[PDB]
């Protein structure tokens, strides 16, 4: 058997809906240290990846490891069916071919038990060679995604030019152009409305709009969000999702 | 005359949207008793049952029977014009053949009077034979709305069963299948949490969902929903419209 | 150099959704008295003027007169990207062919640049005639756009009324007819209740509610819209923009 049980099941309905759109289909790799996602979209633009670490769960038990192939459509409709305070549950019995969802409500006598049917998914997978990043940018999750919805209305790719005092946003399109000056903070109360830039040194990079619109789809897992730059590599936009792992894309930049 | 004045109009406001979208037009029966309202959907696989008994109104007079023919569509259009805070009056003045509406904001000073035409509708009805059933669950509306919106997802038709510390609700289609059970519990702070059951002896049953999803239009109405079940004979989905009478849905069975 | 700053934004915002839906492009002429617009519909139904009063913003500079020729859904794409409680400074060079905007958040060390394309117009600004109006109701904007859409769904004129007493708004279509009655207040001052009719004779007068509905998008700008009426002319709705002047709809009648 393959179990683990997450009182926080909110988690994976956010987890859903930041995949959904951007990935059809994908190989959700189970092994005893947790679970692990990997896919490229379709126009192979960009990446994600998901970790969600065993000790995250409030129970874990995995007996042999899996590589279950998954309609993530199909999995988002289901987990919708799951209220926001529900306790969730993922199971996948040794040789079955289905991968079998539980959501207990916790304040309710009420328990939905779905069964999802899995598909056949030859995924290559391709290794990210790990780096160190010439600018590395906190900021709040909702500022990011209102950002990228603003500037999408003006073009359709935006130019991120990082210093060590601000980060710019900028695009350009038929109807004139807009820049986004952010600056570093100094005073804030809650670290998580904060600004904070590492640089060592500056980058100028362009990149699809459109895209980094599917990512700030995650922005619910997270109040902060970090992009990571360096001349020439994929962007990284990274949500953490607290005591688990994270979600990670990468965007490849604009020639 | 009939005159009828309602304090609570946003009950007639929900009694039409529990109404419109399953049925086009009806013929509202007026008597001394109060208003009654039977009719059967376009398709024949369901009828609709209405009380508004004549005690649940502020005032209400009825000289002589009428069968007003009424297009619930347009009906529905002129409540929306009703604010939820009004008291609303439904009028036919002795020999007219419309039906006045007015609406009074009881904290403003505005009056709206409505004017609907009606239609000549030649329906037969059909006599509904007292029964005993099988099972009667008395739930929460909302969560049985709840349900039936989230099956739907999953497939179009749903199994509903009965255990003795609970009811089930199941359905399958081309992503997989859902299964809810809801149990009881004395654990629960208001009565119309209670799930109640009432069973002579277990039933199972197939019904179309798609047609429990136009009767929980009627949620508004009521906290609580009753539902009447046994072999061979349609469900009825009942709806209490408190101090007034109900709204009964029976919806045929699928073999 | 022209100069605008505006530290209530969200004024700019709010003409520009009142606008744009109605009128496509117009010119925004710039002068030391400040910003004057004036424009017809497409289908010659209905005129527009705005005013916003040099005195209303906190600075502003005019070294010389403009008519700057705008696409208004340009323009309101770009005050989208404007948050509410924004600082809005507009901005135009003497001999440039672009219009600035420059978004300060208050709360926030976020600075936003835009520059807006203009276009090349032929408009030809219209006379406003020597006119005293039969009656002027002053009245809540809030009520006046409820009324406006619900009537809308009874026809597609309405017949406004106006006496000493009240102010009656009535519409006729297939459905049937509804008349509105709104009473003059007896004691006022509440700009979101308060009913005020100054009459030199009674109006009867009939509009197209598809034009009303334009106007009644300038809701957001006051709590109270006031109508003037005389036999054979358009209906003028105002809207005060408090401190700096007035958005202003003109409406042929139906004869
Ligand atoms: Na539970
Ligand atoms: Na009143
Ligand atoms: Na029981
Ligand atoms: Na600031």
């Given at each position: 058997?393959?179990?683990?049980?997450?009182?926080?099941?909110?988690?994976?309905?956010?987890?859903?809906?930041?995949?959904?759109?951007?990935?059809?289909e994908?190989?959700?790799?189970?092994?005893?240290?947790?679970?692990?996602?990997?896919?490229?979209?379709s126009?192979?633009?960009?990446?994600?990846?998901?970790?969600?670490?065993?000790?995250?769960?409030?129970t874990?038990?995995?007996?042999?490891?899996?590589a279950?192939?998954?309609?993530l459509?199909?999995?988002?409709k289901?987990?919708?069916?799951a209220?926001?305070?529900?306790?969730?549950?993922?199971?996948?019995?040794?040789n079955?071919?289905?991968?079998?969802?539980?959501?207990?409500a916790?304040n309710?006598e009420?328990?939905?038990?779905?069964?999802?049917?899995?598909?056949?998914?030859?995924?290559?997978?391709?290794?990210?060679?790990?780096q160190?990043?010439?600018?590395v940018?906190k900021?709040?999750?909702?500022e990011?995604?209102?950002?990228?919805?603003?500037?999408?209305?003006?073009?359709?790719?935006?130019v991120?030019?990082?210093?060590?005092?601000?980060?710019?946003?900028?695009?350009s399109?038929?109807?004139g152009?807009?820049?986004?000056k952010?600056?570093?903070?100094?005073?804030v109360?809650?670290?998580?409305?904060?600004?904070?830039?590492?640089?060592?040194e500056?980058?100028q990079?362009?990149?699809?709009?459109?895209?980094?619109?599917?990512?700030?789809?995650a922005?619910?897992?997270?109040?902060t969000?970090?992009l990571?730059?360096?001349?020439?590599?994929?962007?990284?936009?990274?949500?953490?999702?607290?005591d688990?792992?994270?979600?990670?894309?990468?965007?490849?930049?604009?020639?």
């Amino acid at each position: 058997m393959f179990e683990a049980r997450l009182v926080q099941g909110s988690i994976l309905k956010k987890v859903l809906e930041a995949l959904k759109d951007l990935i059809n289909e994908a190989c959700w790799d189970i092994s005893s240290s947790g679970v692990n996602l990997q896919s490229m979209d379709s126009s192979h633009v960009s990446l994600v990846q998901l970790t969600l670490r065993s000790e995250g769960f409030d129970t874990y038990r995995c007996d042999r490891n899996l590589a279950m192939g998954v309609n993530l459509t199909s999995m988002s409709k289901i987990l919708k069916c799951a209220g926001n305070e529900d306790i969730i549950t993922l199971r996948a019995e040794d040789n079955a071919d289905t991968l079998a969802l539980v959501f207990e409500a916790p304040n309710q006598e009420k328990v939905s038990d779905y069964e999802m049917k899995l598909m056949d998914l030859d995924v290559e997978q391709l290794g990210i060679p790990e780096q160190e990043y010439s600018c590395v940018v906190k900021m709040p999750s909702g500022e990011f995604a209102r950002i990228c919805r603003d500037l999408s209305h003006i073009g359709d790719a935006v130019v991120i030019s990082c210093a060590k005092d601000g980060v710019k946003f900028s695009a350009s399109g038929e109807l004139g152009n807009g820049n986004i000056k952010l600056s570093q903070t100094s005073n804030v109360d809650k670290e998580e409305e904060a600004v904070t830039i590492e640089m060592n040194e500056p980058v100028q990079l362009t990149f699809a709009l459109r895209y980094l619109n599917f990512f700030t789809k995650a922005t619910p897992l997270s109040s902060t969000v970090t992009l990571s730059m360096s001349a020439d590599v994929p962007l990284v936009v990274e949500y953490k999702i607290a005591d688990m792992g994270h979600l990670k894309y990468y965007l490849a930049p604009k020639i």
